[PDB]
Amino acid sequence: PLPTPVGMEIMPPQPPLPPDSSSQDCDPTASLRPFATKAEADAAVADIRARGRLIVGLDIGSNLFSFRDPITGEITGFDVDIAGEVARDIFGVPSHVEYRILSAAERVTALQKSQVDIVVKTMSITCERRKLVNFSTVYLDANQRILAPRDSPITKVSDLSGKRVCVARGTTSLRRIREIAPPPVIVSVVNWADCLVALQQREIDAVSTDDTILAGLVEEDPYLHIVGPDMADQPYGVGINLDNTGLVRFVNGTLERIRNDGTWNTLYRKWLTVLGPAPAPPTPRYVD
Ligand SMILES: N[C@@H](CCC(=O)O)C(=O)O
C-alpha cells in the first residue's frame, strides 16, 4: 500500500489575488553590515557559544538543501552546509549544530519564539516577513518555476489553470500560485518531498516552487522536468529573531567570508550543478 503525504489538503477555491505592488520591495534584501573587529563578532555570539551548539531550524523535505542522506543517515544539503559555516565561525569547526525540525509554515514562529538561533531553510527574504523576523544578506537567489512529468503538456503558467498544483503551506510559492487566473486546484502539503510523492502517485499534476527545490525533486525523479518562465524572485536569507541584530551582523560576516574564500563556490558545485555552472555568489546589500 502506497505512501501518502500526511497533511495533504485541497484548498478552498478562492478568487485570484492581484499581484502585490502594495509593499512590493521595501528593499527587503538590504541587511546589517558585519562587525569590523573579531572581538565584537565573538561577543555577539557569546550566548550561543556558551550553549555549546548552534540551533538551526530546517527540515528534511528539501533534497539538495536539507534532507537525510539515505547512505550516511545524516542531515545534509546546501542549507545544512551554509549553517555549518556559521557554526565554524562561532566554534572553530562546523560540527557544533543541533537541528530543530520545522516546516516551512513554522519558520517565522520559531524565530519569534527564540526556539532556534537561525533558520536556514530556503527562506525567501520578503517585506512582509521582515515585519516579523530579521534576515542576513542573500546567500542564494532562486526563481519560482513549474515541475511536471515529461509527458505533461504543461509548459507555461496559464496551463496550470484548473489543474492540480502542489505547494507547501506557509510559502511564497502558494502566494504566487494564488495569483493565477483562472485558479489552479491548489493542493497543499507540509514539505516539498510530499509534493513529489503526490506527483509520483498521480494525485496532482504539477509542482510550483523555487527552481532550486524543483531541481532537487528532478534529481530524485528524473521522469520530471522543469518548465515555464521565471514566476517570482526568491532571494534566500538566513532567518534571525527580529531583535538579534548582533547575530545578523555575525552571520553577514560569515557570508562575506564564504563568498570570498571559495567556500560558497565549493558548496554550489557540491550540491547545485544540476542547475548549471556556478554563478558568482549573490552580491550582498547593506542598509548601513
Ligand atoms: N523560498 C520560498 C518557497 C520555498 C520554501 O521556502 O519552502 C519561501 O521562502 O517560502
Author numbering: 41 to 328
From the paper:
The conserved aspartate-specific solute-binding protein (SBP) GlnH links extracellular amino acid concentration to PknG activity via the periplasmic transmembrane protein GlnX, thereby controlling glutamate metabolism in Mycobacterium spp. GlnH belongs to the solute-binding protein family, specifically the polar amino acid binding family, which bind to arginine, cysteine, histidine, glutamine, glutamate, and aspartate. The fold of GlnH is related to bacterial solute-binding proteins from ATP transporters and to the sensor domains of glutamate receptors: two lobes close around the Asp ligand in a Venus flytrap-like arrangement. We propose that the amino acid concentration in the periplasm is sensed by GlnH and that protein-protein interaction allows transmission of this information across the membrane via GlnX to activate PknG.
To determine the structural basis of discrimination between higher- and lower-affinity ligands, GlnH was crystallized in the presence of Glu and Asn. Overall, the structures with different ligands bound were similar. The greatest difference is in loops 99 to 103 and 109 to 113 (DIGSN and DPITG, respectively), which are displaced 2 Å in the Glu- or Asn-bound structures compared to the Asp-bound structure. The conformations of the ligand binding site and positioning of the ligands are similar. Contacts between GlnH and Glu are the same as those between GlnH and Asp, with the liganded Glu adopting a bent conformation such that the side-chain carboxyl group occupies the equivalent position to the side chain of ligand Asp in the GlnH-Asp complex. Glutamate and aspartate were identified as the stimuli that lead to rapid phosphorylation of GarA. Our structures of liganded GlnH represent “closed” conformations. Sequence alignment of GlnH homologues that are also genetically linked to PknG shows that within the order Actinomycetales (which includes important human and animal pathogens like Mycobacterium leprae and Rhodococcus equi), conservation of the residues that contact the R group of the Asp/Glu ligand predicts that these proteins are also likely to be specific for Asp and Glu.
